[PDB]
Each structure stands twice: as C-alpha cells, then as structure tokens.
Amino acid sequence: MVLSEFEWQLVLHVWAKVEADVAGHGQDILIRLFKSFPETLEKFDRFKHLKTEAEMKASEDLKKVGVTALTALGAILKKKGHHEAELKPLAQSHATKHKIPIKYLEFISCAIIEVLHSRHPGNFGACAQGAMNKALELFRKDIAAKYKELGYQG
Numbered sequence: 001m002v003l004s005e006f007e008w009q010l011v012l013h014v015w016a017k018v019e020a021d022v023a024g025h026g027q028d029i030l031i032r033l034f035k036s037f038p039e040t041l042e043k044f045d046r047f048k049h050l051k052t053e054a055e056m057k058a059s060e061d062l063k064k065v066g067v068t069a070l071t072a073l074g075a076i077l078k079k080k081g082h083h084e085a086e087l088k089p090l091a092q093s094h095a096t097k098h099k100i101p102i103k104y105l106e107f108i109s110c111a112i113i114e115v116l117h118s119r120h121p122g123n124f125g126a127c128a129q130g131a132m133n134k135a136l137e138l139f140r141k142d143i144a145a146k147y148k149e150l151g152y153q154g
C-alpha cells in the first residue's frame with residue numbers, strides 16, 4: 001500500500017493538533033487502550049492499581065508513556081512511509097523485549113483515531129480518519145514485516 005500526498009497531508013495536519021497538547025492526547029489514547037481493550041493493561045504491571053479513567057489521569061508515569069509513543073509515531077508519520085530506520089529499533093524492542101502482538105498495535109491505532117476524532121470532530125472528518133487509518137495500517141504492515149525478520153509472528 002502507498003498513501004497519496006493528499007493522504008499524508010491530512011495525517012500531518014491532524015498531527016500538528018496532537019502536538020499542541022501531546023500530554024492530553026497521550027493520556028487519552030492510553031486510557032482508551034486500557035479501558036476498551038483491558039487485556040493490554042497486563043503489559044504495564046506497574047499500572048495495576050489504576051482501575052478507572054480518573055485514576056489513570058493522575059499518573060504522570062502513564063502520561064509519559066503516552067508521550068513517548070506519540071513522539072516516536074509522529075517522527076514516523078513525518079517520513080511519509082520512508083520510515084525503515086525508525087521502525088528498526090521499535091520492532092526490536094516490541095517484538096523481543098516488550099512482546100507486543102501486532103493485534104495490540106491494531107488496538108492502539110484504533111484508539112489513536114478515535115481519540116483524535118473525540119478531541120477534533122470538526123477537523124477530523126471521514127476522509128482524514130481514512131487517511132490516518134491507511135497511515136497506521138502501513139506502519140503496522142511494515143513493523144509486522146520487521147517482526148518476521150526477527151523470527152516473530154507477532
């Protein structure tokens with residue numbers, strides 16, 4: 001799959017809004033991940049006492065985890081698919097160390113799109129949601145290929 005320039009521009013336009021409050025987006029995305037797909041919380045044992053949205057919102061640690069992921073993803077999206085160098089260390093750590101299945105990357109991709117729609121409904125319409133869906137699908141396809149090159153199914 002290959003995105004058009006129009007699709008990349010829709011993705012990068014909404015990402016500038018993410019960056020304007022990266023902490024709030026990162027919190028909301030991880031909270032949605034943990035609440036809508038509760039199985040993912042097991043990958044973060046240190047968050048085991050955070051049982052509700054408001055408890056999660058108090059955690060600077062959880063916020064930092066979200067900002068770390070959004071920062072890496074933003075750098076990837078700005079490469080407009082020429083992101084092999086950025087995916088190398090991410091596949092290494094997520095396949096071999098954190099053991100994150102590709103399905104969980106699908107979940108967080110979905111959570112990203114839904115949080116962006118919740119926070120920016122007037123500027124993140126159906127076309128922009130579809131462009132972000134394509135960009136994140138490309139990310140997952142390419143990282144899954146790297147998982148397989150490390151010997152993991154994902």
Ligand code: HEM
Binds near residue numbers: 043072089090094108
């Ligand atoms: C857009 C998708 C994601 C991106 C860009 C991303 C990015 C990152 C980055 C940059 C780090 C720190 C460096 C590293 O260890 O490679 C990290 C750490 C980590 N990530 Fe991911 N991540 C993503 C999805 C996920 C998901 C879905 C999970 C679990 C359900 C996960 C679990 C972890 C864990 C356990 C760590 C170790 C650090 C910590 O415990 O806070 N990641 N991630």
